[PDB]
Amino acid sequence: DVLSARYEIVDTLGEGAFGKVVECIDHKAGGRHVAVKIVKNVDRYCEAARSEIQVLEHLNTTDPNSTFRCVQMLEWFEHHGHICIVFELLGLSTYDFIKENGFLPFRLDHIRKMAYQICKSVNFLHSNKLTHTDLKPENILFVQSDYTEAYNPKIKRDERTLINPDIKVVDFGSATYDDEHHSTLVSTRHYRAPEVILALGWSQPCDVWSIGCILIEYYLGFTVFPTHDSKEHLAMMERILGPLPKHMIQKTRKRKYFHHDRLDWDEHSSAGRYVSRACKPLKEFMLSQDVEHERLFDLIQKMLEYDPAKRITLREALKHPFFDLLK
Ligand SMILES: C[C@@H](c1ccc(F)cc1)n1nnc2cnc3ccc(-c4ccc5ocnc5c4)cc3c21
């Protein structure tokens, strides 16, 4: 298939509820390939795609050189009733890279620069009265996914090391302005903030919670929330972070999760023993007591503050000691 008389599909990069993203040759322009998002002809996804186009048009006007590392939209059009958005071609997602590495975690120096760029990008959105709402490693993509495969003696396996860890943030179809309607449920479950789970209302801080989850995943290679159930997810939080704040518990209407304004959770049920084996207090996940591991986990703990009003902002996160070896 050849959209818009110039774009020949050569590969499908990824597929989702919205449609797919394909890699295309541009037969009119010089031959650097592009990424093309082809949106399903369903109202739900059409409307998100038009919102994405509006957001990216305004971000391109404010930040035409992508200083703040949002993916660059090159053009958009309609084709057989599908909205098609042409993007600069990026490399693998940060999730794809970890997975293809056998779920080996990223090196701390790479985590530092990736976290910085992520916080920079999302803080730019937040500066602009926008919340992303769907931050996850799948929506953080490497500008170039080239690697060197080195022998790692510890322990005895070949491992892939990023040549350049620069990223960009993608997927603005769920992004929500301060004054716009806020969806009831946002984010992918493992990155979803507690105020979303408890239906208390959400704003920019829910992005910070997701980034905190992303950072631990980069550090560990796996999610600390291996769950597909909301009450179990809350039990995992309490295992990692301590009890939920009482003020959040009495404000929620999610009464099925609570007994006497405490989480209705049997730690000695079968699911309770699953949680106890999969999760543990946050700092027990640290693999070193070195000061820069300590500052990463201090940053993560501040991003995983339960109360969205007390959670660190990305403006404050950007000044965190963890990022010093970058400056
Ligand atoms: C997880 C992600 C994604 C989807 C497909 C894919 F191949 C890679 C990433 N994703 N999930 N939901 C959405 C919505 N809109 C988008 C718009 C663009 C891109 C995007 C942009 C440039 C790319 O360069 C290479 N893959 C890319 C994907 C991804 C998305 C997108």
Tab-separated table of C-alpha atoms and ligand atoms in Angstrom:
chain	number	residue	atom	x	y	z
A	1	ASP	CA	0.000	0.000	0.000
A	2	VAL	CA	1.175	3.547	-0.839
A	3	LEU	CA	-0.587	6.282	1.152
A	4	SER	CA	-0.949	9.847	-0.163
A	5	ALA	CA	0.793	8.862	-3.454
A	6	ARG	CA	4.218	9.038	-1.784
A	7	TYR	CA	4.465	6.745	1.278
A	8	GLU	CA	5.125	3.061	0.583
A	9	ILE	CA	4.724	0.829	3.611
A	10	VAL	CA	7.718	-1.348	4.257
A	11	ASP	CA	7.056	-2.593	7.743
A	12	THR	CA	4.682	-2.560	10.604
A	13	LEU	CA	6.396	-1.211	13.694
A	14	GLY	CA	3.688	-1.753	16.237
A	15	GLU	CA	-0.071	-2.162	16.624
A	16	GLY	CA	-2.555	-1.179	19.277
A	17	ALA	CA	-6.144	-0.259	20.016
A	18	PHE	CA	-5.726	2.908	17.936
A	19	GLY	CA	-4.501	1.236	14.763
A	20	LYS	CA	-0.880	0.707	13.775
A	21	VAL	CA	2.389	2.537	13.192
A	22	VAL	CA	4.159	1.553	9.978
A	23	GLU	CA	7.568	2.352	8.544
A	24	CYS	CA	7.376	3.973	5.105
A	25	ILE	CA	9.631	4.934	2.256
A	26	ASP	CA	8.930	8.489	1.086
A	27	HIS	CA	9.007	8.230	-2.709
A	28	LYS	CA	8.729	12.018	-3.235
A	29	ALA	CA	11.298	13.249	-0.730
A	30	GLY	CA	14.875	12.157	-0.186
A	31	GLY	CA	15.127	8.656	1.144
A	32	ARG	CA	15.147	8.792	4.934
A	33	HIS	CA	12.295	6.543	6.066
A	34	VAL	CA	9.400	7.877	8.160
A	35	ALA	CA	6.937	6.488	10.694
A	36	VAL	CA	3.233	6.685	9.832
A	37	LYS	CA	0.452	6.212	12.359
A	38	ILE	CA	-2.664	4.847	10.612
A	39	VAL	CA	-5.694	5.312	12.856
A	40	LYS	CA	-8.698	2.984	12.862
A	41	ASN	CA	-11.869	4.363	11.287
A	42	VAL	CA	-13.609	4.382	14.670
A	43	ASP	CA	-14.896	7.609	16.247
A	44	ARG	CA	-13.072	6.947	19.541
A	45	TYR	CA	-9.671	6.758	17.864
A	46	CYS	CA	-10.336	9.389	15.191
A	47	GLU	CA	-11.114	11.943	17.903
A	48	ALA	CA	-7.954	11.049	19.850
A	49	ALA	CA	-5.890	11.351	16.655
A	50	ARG	CA	-7.304	14.813	15.913
A	51	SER	CA	-6.540	15.879	19.479
A	52	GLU	CA	-3.011	14.519	19.034
A	53	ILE	CA	-2.622	16.543	15.827
A	54	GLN	CA	-3.809	19.709	17.582
A	55	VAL	CA	-1.405	19.133	20.472
A	56	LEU	CA	1.539	18.395	18.194
A	57	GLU	CA	0.790	21.411	15.987
A	58	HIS	CA	0.943	23.685	19.046
A	59	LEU	CA	4.071	21.988	20.405
A	60	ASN	CA	5.751	22.327	16.983
A	61	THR	CA	5.016	26.056	17.000
A	62	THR	CA	6.446	26.497	20.511
A	63	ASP	CA	9.321	24.001	20.137
A	64	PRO	CA	10.013	23.513	16.405
A	65	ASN	CA	13.399	21.849	17.046
A	66	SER	CA	12.099	19.414	19.666
A	67	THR	CA	14.364	20.847	22.358
A	68	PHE	CA	12.038	19.142	24.839
A	69	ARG	CA	12.110	15.804	23.040
A	70	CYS	CA	8.494	15.330	22.037
A	71	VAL	CA	8.266	13.298	18.821
A	72	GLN	CA	8.073	15.475	15.694
A	73	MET	CA	5.008	15.319	13.479
A	74	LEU	CA	5.960	15.985	9.853
A	75	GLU	CA	2.467	16.100	8.305
A	76	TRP	CA	-0.964	14.475	8.474
A	77	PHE	CA	-3.675	13.511	5.983
A	78	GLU	CA	-6.698	11.254	5.407
A	79	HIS	CA	-6.637	8.098	3.267
A	80	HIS	CA	-9.593	5.740	2.677
A	81	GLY	CA	-11.231	7.269	5.735
A	82	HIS	CA	-8.214	6.758	8.023
A	83	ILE	CA	-6.308	9.601	9.661
A	84	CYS	CA	-2.578	9.171	8.992
A	85	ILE	CA	0.070	11.056	10.971
A	86	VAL	CA	3.617	11.128	9.605
A	87	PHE	CA	6.354	11.180	12.267
A	88	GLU	CA	10.118	11.243	12.267
A	89	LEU	CA	11.254	7.622	12.417
A	90	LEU	CA	12.557	6.691	15.875
A	91	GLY	CA	14.189	3.482	17.065
A	92	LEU	CA	13.032	0.883	19.549
A	93	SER	CA	11.014	1.779	22.601
A	94	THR	CA	12.808	1.619	25.914
A	95	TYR	CA	10.585	-1.377	26.720
A	96	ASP	CA	11.514	-3.202	23.482
A	97	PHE	CA	15.199	-2.673	24.274
A	98	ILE	CA	14.985	-4.105	27.804
A	99	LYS	CA	12.932	-7.038	26.508
A	100	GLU	CA	15.331	-7.739	23.635
A	101	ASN	CA	18.172	-7.580	26.183
A	102	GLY	CA	16.526	-10.400	28.146
A	103	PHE	CA	15.142	-7.876	30.673
A	104	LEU	CA	18.559	-6.783	31.818
A	105	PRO	CA	18.216	-3.343	33.411
A	106	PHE	CA	19.685	-0.191	31.994
A	107	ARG	CA	23.009	1.036	33.352
A	108	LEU	CA	22.657	3.769	35.977
A	109	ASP	CA	24.356	6.452	33.856
A	110	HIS	CA	21.927	5.743	31.028
A	111	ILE	CA	18.981	5.793	33.441
A	112	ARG	CA	20.146	9.212	34.651
A	113	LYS	CA	20.134	10.796	31.200
A	114	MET	CA	16.919	9.041	30.109
A	115	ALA	CA	15.073	10.091	33.272
A	116	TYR	CA	16.344	13.638	32.819
A	117	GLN	CA	15.106	13.839	29.220
A	118	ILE	CA	11.779	12.256	30.175
A	119	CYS	CA	11.242	14.718	33.022
A	120	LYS	CA	12.341	17.604	30.755
A	121	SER	CA	9.871	16.546	28.055
A	122	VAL	CA	6.939	15.993	30.391
A	123	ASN	CA	7.683	19.164	32.372
A	124	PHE	CA	7.463	21.057	29.052
A	125	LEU	CA	3.993	19.569	28.599
A	126	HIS	CA	3.108	20.463	32.182
A	127	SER	CA	4.359	24.039	31.527
A	128	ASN	CA	1.842	24.175	28.743
A	129	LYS	CA	-1.180	23.038	30.812
A	130	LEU	CA	-1.054	19.504	29.486
A	131	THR	CA	-0.921	16.102	31.177
A	132	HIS	CA	0.281	13.151	29.076
A	133	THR	CA	-1.671	10.533	31.159
A	134	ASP	CA	-0.185	7.440	29.409
A	135	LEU	CA	3.518	7.490	30.215
A	136	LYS	CA	5.068	4.029	30.041
A	137	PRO	CA	8.319	2.571	28.687
A	138	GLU	CA	6.503	1.655	25.475
A	139	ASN	CA	5.881	5.391	24.838
A	140	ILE	CA	9.529	6.370	25.409
A	141	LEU	CA	11.503	5.690	22.224
A	142	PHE	CA	15.174	5.812	21.470
A	143	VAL	CA	16.224	8.274	18.819
A	144	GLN	CA	18.680	5.544	17.734
A	145	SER	CA	18.624	2.013	19.093
A	146	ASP	CA	22.151	1.064	17.997
A	147	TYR	CA	24.116	-0.984	20.490
A	148	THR	CA	27.376	-2.785	21.049
A	149	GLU	CA	27.121	-6.412	22.132
A	150	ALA	CA	29.809	-6.898	24.771
A	151	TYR	CA	30.864	-9.901	26.787
A	152	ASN	CA	29.677	-9.290	30.336
A	153	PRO	CA	31.678	-11.509	32.714
A	154	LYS	CA	29.192	-10.714	35.488
A	155	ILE	CA	27.788	-13.010	34.591
A	156	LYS	CA	28.824	-14.779	31.562
A	157	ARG	CA	26.509	-13.581	28.980
A	158	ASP	CA	26.677	-11.217	26.039
A	159	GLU	CA	24.805	-8.001	26.795
A	160	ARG	CA	23.692	-5.083	24.618
A	161	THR	CA	24.802	-1.578	25.576
A	162	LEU	CA	23.165	1.539	24.128
A	163	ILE	CA	25.466	3.680	22.037
A	164	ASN	CA	23.257	6.763	22.486
A	165	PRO	CA	20.504	6.792	25.155
A	166	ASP	CA	18.655	9.875	23.824
A	167	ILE	CA	14.874	9.436	23.846
A	168	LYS	CA	11.681	11.118	22.732
A	169	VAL	CA	8.167	10.882	24.170
A	170	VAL	CA	5.352	9.675	21.921
A	171	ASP	CA	1.605	9.319	21.952
A	172	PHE	CA	-0.192	12.552	22.588
A	173	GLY	CA	-3.685	11.123	21.830
A	174	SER	CA	-4.585	10.924	25.533
A	175	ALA	CA	-2.988	14.247	26.513
A	176	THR	CA	-5.419	16.452	28.426
A	177	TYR	CA	-5.430	20.203	29.024
A	178	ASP	CA	-6.047	21.610	32.506
A	179	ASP	CA	-9.433	23.057	31.491
A	180	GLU	CA	-10.592	20.076	29.380
A	181	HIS	CA	-12.717	17.066	30.303
A	182	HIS	CA	-10.704	14.506	32.273
A	183	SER	CA	-11.346	10.829	31.523
A	184	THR	CA	-12.371	8.702	34.496
A	185	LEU	CA	-9.618	6.140	33.931
A	186	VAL	CA	-6.200	6.994	32.520
A	187	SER	CA	-2.751	5.392	32.182
A	188	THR	CA	-1.784	1.790	31.631
A	189	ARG	CA	-2.427	-0.185	34.813
A	190	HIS	CA	1.147	-0.775	36.023
A	191	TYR	CA	1.880	2.972	35.671
A	192	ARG	CA	-1.427	4.233	37.052
A	193	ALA	CA	-1.380	6.622	40.003
A	194	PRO	CA	-3.423	5.909	43.169
A	195	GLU	CA	-5.632	8.975	42.715
A	196	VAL	CA	-6.717	7.456	39.395
A	197	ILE	CA	-7.427	4.026	40.947
A	198	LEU	CA	-9.436	5.676	43.751
A	199	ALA	CA	-11.225	8.034	41.289
A	200	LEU	CA	-10.257	11.127	43.286
A	201	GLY	CA	-9.494	13.256	40.252
A	202	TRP	CA	-6.126	13.613	38.614
A	203	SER	CA	-3.943	16.336	37.139
A	204	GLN	CA	-0.270	16.730	36.204
A	205	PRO	CA	1.018	14.785	39.282
A	206	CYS	CA	-0.344	11.504	37.850
A	207	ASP	CA	2.363	11.805	35.157
A	208	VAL	CA	4.981	12.010	37.911
A	209	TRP	CA	3.706	8.775	39.477
A	210	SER	CA	4.019	7.022	36.106
A	211	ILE	CA	7.586	8.306	35.677
A	212	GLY	CA	8.454	6.927	39.115
A	213	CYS	CA	7.176	3.516	37.986
A	214	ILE	CA	9.118	3.811	34.742
A	215	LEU	CA	12.355	4.580	36.591
A	216	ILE	CA	12.111	1.528	38.872
A	217	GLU	CA	11.431	-0.633	35.826
A	218	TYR	CA	14.536	0.733	34.093
A	219	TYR	CA	16.521	-0.014	37.254
A	220	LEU	CA	15.186	-3.535	37.860
A	221	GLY	CA	14.270	-4.765	34.394
A	222	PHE	CA	10.791	-5.746	35.641
A	223	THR	CA	7.696	-4.030	37.033
A	224	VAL	CA	7.141	-3.823	40.786
A	225	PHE	CA	3.375	-4.031	40.122
A	226	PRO	CA	2.874	-7.459	38.401
A	227	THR	CA	-0.921	-7.336	38.637
A	228	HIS	CA	-4.134	-7.068	36.611
A	229	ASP	CA	-6.472	-6.257	39.523
A	230	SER	CA	-7.041	-2.890	41.208
A	231	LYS	CA	-7.286	-4.020	44.828
A	232	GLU	CA	-4.186	-6.204	44.482
A	233	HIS	CA	-2.422	-3.216	42.905
A	234	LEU	CA	-3.266	-1.178	46.016
A	235	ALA	CA	-2.001	-4.019	48.206
A	236	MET	CA	1.255	-3.989	46.239
A	237	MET	CA	1.619	-0.229	46.772
A	238	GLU	CA	1.141	-0.684	50.528
A	239	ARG	CA	3.752	-3.442	50.544
A	240	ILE	CA	6.256	-1.216	48.704
A	241	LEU	CA	5.342	2.223	50.073
A	242	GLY	CA	3.510	1.775	53.381
A	243	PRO	CA	-0.177	2.284	54.142
A	244	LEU	CA	-2.338	4.535	51.997
A	245	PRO	CA	-3.096	7.913	53.601
A	246	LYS	CA	-6.359	7.923	55.537
A	247	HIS	CA	-7.561	11.151	53.908
A	248	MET	CA	-7.402	9.557	50.468
A	249	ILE	CA	-9.196	6.458	51.789
A	250	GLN	CA	-12.152	8.315	53.229
A	251	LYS	CA	-12.550	10.488	50.121
A	252	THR	CA	-12.801	7.601	47.660
A	253	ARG	CA	-16.114	6.091	46.596
A	254	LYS	CA	-14.290	2.811	45.801
A	255	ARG	CA	-15.699	1.279	48.960
A	256	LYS	CA	-15.266	-2.306	47.728
A	257	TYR	CA	-11.507	-1.972	48.325
A	258	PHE	CA	-11.773	-0.992	52.002
A	259	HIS	CA	-12.929	-2.269	55.405
A	260	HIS	CA	-13.019	0.209	58.322
A	261	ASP	CA	-11.149	2.721	56.125
A	262	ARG	CA	-8.266	0.328	55.629
A	263	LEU	CA	-7.512	-1.765	52.547
A	264	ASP	CA	-9.616	-4.947	52.558
A	265	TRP	CA	-6.651	-7.277	52.082
A	266	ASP	CA	-5.722	-10.627	53.655
A	267	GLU	CA	-1.921	-10.830	53.559
A	268	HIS	CA	-2.183	-14.590	54.246
A	269	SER	CA	-4.587	-15.326	51.427
A	270	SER	CA	-3.094	-16.914	48.331
A	271	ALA	CA	-3.071	-13.526	46.579
A	272	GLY	CA	-1.526	-12.015	49.711
A	273	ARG	CA	1.391	-14.427	49.617
A	274	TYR	CA	1.827	-13.663	45.903
A	275	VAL	CA	2.077	-9.955	46.739
A	276	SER	CA	4.517	-10.624	49.598
A	277	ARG	CA	6.816	-12.578	47.279
A	278	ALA	CA	6.614	-10.190	44.329
A	279	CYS	CA	6.810	-6.920	46.294
A	280	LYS	CA	8.806	-5.569	49.226
A	281	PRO	CA	9.609	-2.143	50.725
A	282	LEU	CA	10.957	0.197	48.064
A	283	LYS	CA	14.522	0.599	49.332
A	284	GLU	CA	14.903	-3.184	49.662
A	285	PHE	CA	14.954	-3.205	45.829
A	286	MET	CA	18.223	-1.221	45.785
A	287	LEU	CA	21.120	-3.289	44.473
A	288	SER	CA	23.744	-0.975	46.005
A	289	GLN	CA	24.006	1.448	48.928
A	290	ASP	CA	26.220	3.764	46.850
A	291	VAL	CA	25.160	7.401	47.073
A	292	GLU	CA	23.933	7.684	43.478
A	293	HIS	CA	21.737	4.611	43.864
A	294	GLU	CA	20.549	6.291	47.070
A	295	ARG	CA	19.671	9.502	45.244
A	296	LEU	CA	17.854	7.654	42.455
A	297	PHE	CA	15.729	5.896	45.069
A	298	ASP	CA	15.163	9.153	46.926
A	299	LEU	CA	13.870	10.626	43.648
A	300	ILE	CA	11.688	7.565	42.955
A	301	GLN	CA	10.246	7.691	46.473
A	302	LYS	CA	9.327	11.355	46.008
A	303	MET	CA	7.657	10.572	42.671
A	304	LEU	CA	5.756	7.700	44.334
A	305	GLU	CA	4.293	9.917	47.051
A	306	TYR	CA	0.666	8.807	47.538
A	307	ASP	CA	-0.822	12.295	47.921
A	308	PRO	CA	-0.740	14.003	44.504
A	309	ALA	CA	-0.633	17.393	46.268
A	310	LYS	CA	2.608	16.402	48.062
A	311	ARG	CA	4.245	14.554	45.155
A	312	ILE	CA	7.396	16.166	43.752
A	313	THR	CA	6.781	18.284	40.660
A	314	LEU	CA	8.863	17.765	37.552
A	315	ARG	CA	10.254	21.293	37.913
A	316	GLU	CA	11.542	20.226	41.351
A	317	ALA	CA	12.536	16.769	40.048
A	318	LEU	CA	14.805	18.360	37.436
A	319	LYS	CA	16.930	19.902	40.219
A	320	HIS	CA	17.294	16.618	42.106
A	321	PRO	CA	20.833	15.560	43.137
A	322	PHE	CA	20.459	12.409	41.057
A	323	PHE	CA	20.945	14.501	37.890
A	324	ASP	CA	24.217	16.226	38.940
A	325	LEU	CA	26.696	14.059	37.023
A	326	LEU	CA	24.787	15.239	33.949
A	327	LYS	CA	25.583	18.917	34.559
B	1	LIG	C1	3.412	2.426	22.146
B	1	LIG	C2	3.373	3.353	20.958
B	1	LIG	C3	3.938	2.726	19.802
B	1	LIG	C4	3.119	2.180	18.863
B	1	LIG	C5	3.632	1.573	17.757
B	1	LIG	C6	4.994	1.514	17.621
B	1	LIG	F1	5.525	0.946	16.581
B	1	LIG	C7	5.801	2.096	18.574
B	1	LIG	C8	5.291	2.678	19.685
B	1	LIG	N1	2.110	4.117	20.804
B	1	LIG	N2	1.073	3.697	21.591
B	1	LIG	N3	0.012	4.524	21.385
B	1	LIG	C9	0.333	5.431	20.507
B	1	LIG	C10	-0.332	6.473	19.938
B	1	LIG	N4	0.273	7.231	19.063
B	1	LIG	C11	1.512	7.046	18.653
B	1	LIG	C12	2.051	7.900	17.738
B	1	LIG	C13	3.319	7.727	17.275
B	1	LIG	C14	4.113	6.717	17.787
B	1	LIG	C15	5.427	6.533	17.192
B	1	LIG	C16	6.114	7.568	16.648
B	1	LIG	C17	7.320	7.365	16.037
B	1	LIG	C18	7.823	6.123	15.925
B	1	LIG	O1	8.930	5.759	15.395
B	1	LIG	C19	8.966	4.433	15.530
B	1	LIG	N5	7.896	4.007	16.178
B	1	LIG	C20	7.106	5.010	16.467
B	1	LIG	C21	5.897	5.234	17.064
B	1	LIG	C22	3.616	5.828	18.708
B	1	LIG	C23	2.331	5.946	19.175
B	1	LIG	C24	1.716	5.134	20.096
